Structures are given as C-alpha cells and as structure tokens.
Amino acid sequence: FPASLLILNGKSTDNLPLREAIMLLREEGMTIHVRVTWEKGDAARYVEEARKFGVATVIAGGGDGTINEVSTALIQCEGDDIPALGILPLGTANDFATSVGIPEALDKALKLAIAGDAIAIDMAQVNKQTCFINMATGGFGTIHGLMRMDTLQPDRCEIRGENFHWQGDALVIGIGNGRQAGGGQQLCPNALINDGLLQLRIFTGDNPNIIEGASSWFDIQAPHDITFNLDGEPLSGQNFHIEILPAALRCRLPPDCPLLR
C-alpha cells in the first residue's frame, strides 16, 4: 500500500465526507497523513515533510491555487523520490481539476489521487519564479471573475516565442497550460499539458480579433504594467518571460485524460 500525505487548504476543511472517506481508507490499510495550511509557504513545508516519510503521492486538497503551491514546491525538490501529485477538487472553482476530468464523486477522486497512474506533465513558470499549472490571463487594469479584474482597457504590448512575434494593443492575453480559466470557458481550447508548449491567445479590440500561437516560451513586454492572474495569484509588471518546465512533475490523472496528447 502506497503512503500519501494530504495537504488540505485551510478553507475546505469541514467536510465530514472527506473525514469519513479518510477513515475508511486508513483502516483498509492506507497511510494518509493530513496537514492543513494556514497561509503562503505552508504547502512547501508539508511537501518537505512528505519527502521525509518517503510518501508516494502528495495530494492537493484545494482549487487551482493550492494545486500550484503544492506543484511549485514539488517541482523544486532536489533529489530522487519526489512524490507524485494527486488532486482533490475542493476549491470554489476547480477549473484545472474539472478539465483533466478528476472525478466529481469524492471517494473515486481520492482513489485516483492515491492509486492512479502517474503521468509526467508540464508546469509553466513566470520569470524563473512564480509557477502555474493551468492558466495565465493578462490585462491592463489596476472582464469580472472572468479574471480577478474590473477595468479592462486595451494597451500596447509586444509578445514573442518560437517563430512567433506580435505587437499591438490587446485587451486580454491568455497563455495556457490548460484549457479553461476561472469560471470555465476555453481560452485555449487545444492546450495539452504534455506537449511542452504553452498556447497563446491574444484578444484584440473589445478570425482577426484573436491571434494564436504555441511555444515552449513567450516573452511579453509593455510600457505600462500588465496584470497577470496566474491561477489566482496576481503578478504585475512590464516584463514577463513565461517558460514551460516540460515534464516537471508526475500527476495521478484518469486514464482518458482530455489534456494529454
């Protein structure tokens, strides 16, 4: 039986079913450590702790943000027995988990997350620092839950990647590892998380209105600040280098997964 440590996002705690689901399995003979996060940096600590135990999987119990905190710490482990990632959709939206088709049924999800066949997948990383496993969307702000932003105005940027170059004013920039952002509409409907490419969609104005591209990297510059929402995390600035970390971690994913080549 493979050991697991589950990292619960502080919000999604209270959930009698999950508690009872963890009991059932623990006595069926599975080790499932649990750890609850209170804030940024907690994820990494409990990942480190998972490594101590030599656990098989670390399971992100959360929405996209918790999945990133766990992933980012995963993909910055030194060494040899890095745990895989497993996912339990416990955010308020779970765009990433829905789109890889993590089971809605709570017990089956655990079952996948603990026993599933792990498969190497890509992470995206911004300015050799912040990471994201799903979607980056960018705007000139300061629309709605459409991307944690409120005033959206078109403004100059220049963007480049392998045999890709573009310059103009733009309203939204979606660079995806996955298909669907917050809410759950396809910004990059053909993304795969194992092709080693980011998908780029530039929304011009307010088909010539959308420019598209696919590259293992994109540089973005703008004279005024761009506001990127990276799987919930905000990042502002005039220079972004977004690069794929190909095959950076192993995820327990269901067999048919829609986002695998």
Curated annotation (Swiss-Prot):
Binds 1 Mg(2+) ion per subunit. Ca(2+) may be able to substitute. The active site is at E233. It is an enzyme of class 2 (transferase). One of its GO terms (biological process) is phospholipid biosynthetic process. Residues 1-130 form the DAGKc domain. ATP binds at T37, G63, D64, G65, T66, I67, N68, E69, T92. Its EC number is 2.7.1.-. Monomer. In vitro phosphorylates phosphatidylglycerol but not diacylglycerol; the in vivo substrate is unknown. This is Lipid kinase YegS. It comes from Escherichia coli (strain K12).
